[PDB]
Amino acid sequence: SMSYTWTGALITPCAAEESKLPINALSNSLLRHHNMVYATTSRSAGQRQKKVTFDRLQVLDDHYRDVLKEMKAKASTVKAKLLSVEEACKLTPPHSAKSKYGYGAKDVRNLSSRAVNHIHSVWKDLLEDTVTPIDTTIMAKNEVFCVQPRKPARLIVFPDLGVRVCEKMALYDVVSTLPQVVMGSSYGFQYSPGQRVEFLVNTWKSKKNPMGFSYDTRCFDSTVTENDIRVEESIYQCCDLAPEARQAIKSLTERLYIGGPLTNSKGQNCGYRRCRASGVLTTSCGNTLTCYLKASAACRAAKLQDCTMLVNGDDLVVICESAGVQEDAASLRVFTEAMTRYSAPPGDPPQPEYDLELITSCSSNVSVAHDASGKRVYYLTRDPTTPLARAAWETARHTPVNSWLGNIIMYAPTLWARMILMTHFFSILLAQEQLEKALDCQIYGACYSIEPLDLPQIIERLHGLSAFSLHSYSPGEINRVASCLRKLGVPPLRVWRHRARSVRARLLSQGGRAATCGKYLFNWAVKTKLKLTPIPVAGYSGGDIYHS
């Protein structure tokens, strides 16, 4: 079974595409080496098509079926509800792609009679027809990166707006509640970053002689087979469901999730999909369940002892009891052989690690700093190259997703988010008097509208109060940041400290919520520190989900 078949019609853009970093009067203050930053476009879509197109063979053994049966037993305890049209409508992002049938996301959100009527007709059709493949649009994503001695565009596959609202009706409650019940503490999207870090540290310490590894499947969405998507459905069907929900889920599975025709932005047939669609409601939950199933079975095949898995989408980490360096290495090759039999070979082979900090997953690693009292605090960080490249782009261009804001929220304890992103963007917001303006950003795939003035409260909840007083960062973390700054031609950390003092003073001058940002976000910038006191579920990547 080929992941895709192609007609030769091109994957076309829906608008003008920029590959070159836009420059304005603020650009050079952040980043001087402009030619290092680029955006992917549909021009590289052909390259990605080649990468994502391959045959999938699957060999399923008793370990696989044993794990599945256990997963189904837990799924059978879940009771999920149907969302009303209105509930589903309110989960639709304001800027979500408009329907081909004469309405858009704002119409959906307002419960306009044209939108609601069409949605009712799509629902009725799902109930009555379980065979006809549902159309999807295929597009090239425009994403910004730094060059490394260029990545081709990622592809997004999604159905019409009316269908997307129907998916929410049938499955939003399922994808929100089932993964945690089936996978327990292994379901990664249940955690805030602070909770995630705590869970990783505690898990590592729970082993007598800990060993851990990341496993990254090559082109995971393309590795997902018809079997995998039917197995996912069978898990969902274990739930206590409304009869209408059961029918819609079956219909969606047969008609959309298993596969279907691919249409470009110009309406031309591009080919056919027999793998995971990247832009459906079930992408995150389906990938997580499938990765967990295959990985759990593979742990058993490799006889890994006292495994604790952490899984979110296609990202996987296993922490377990070491049997010794030589035996661990052998056991990972067996793990990999099993995963490969299940259709999920790795991009690069997994490596056993005997220090938590040497494991990288979702581009991130655990590092250590110290709070106000000198106590060790663990936090998740990453290489700041991509965040800074996207910050540079967003300095010069308004974009639908404000990666900078998401990065500040999710990487708030990091030296680079605090010193560079907070300083740079608060300066911009001050200049435009836009501190109070809500902005769109992404947390675990779901879209959120967030006012920058609420960052202190948000950071405290996701990371704890220590996120505003961390110091004595590791030499390795400091060196990675500094090295990234030289690479991109970003001013050194000393310059950012100086700018932050100014930004802080400006925020304090404003009083109110602005002053609170000054006090908490920039306490690191001042010599004599002000005493800081407390301030008064699931993943949905590609799921077209919104919250305010």
Ligand SMILES: CNC(=O)c1c(-c2ccc(F)cc2)oc2cc(N(c3ccc(B(O)O)cc3)S(C)(=O)=O)c(C3CC3)cc12
């Ligand atoms: C299975 N892997 C893991 O659980 C994660 C490890 C990891 C685990 C073990 C280990 F040893 C090292 C890292 O670190 C993580 C960090 C995050 N975070 C984000 C990562 C990437 C993006 B982005 O490029 O879209 C956004 C958030 S976060 C909020 O904590 O900083 C996540 C989030 C998606 C859920 C998972 C893991």
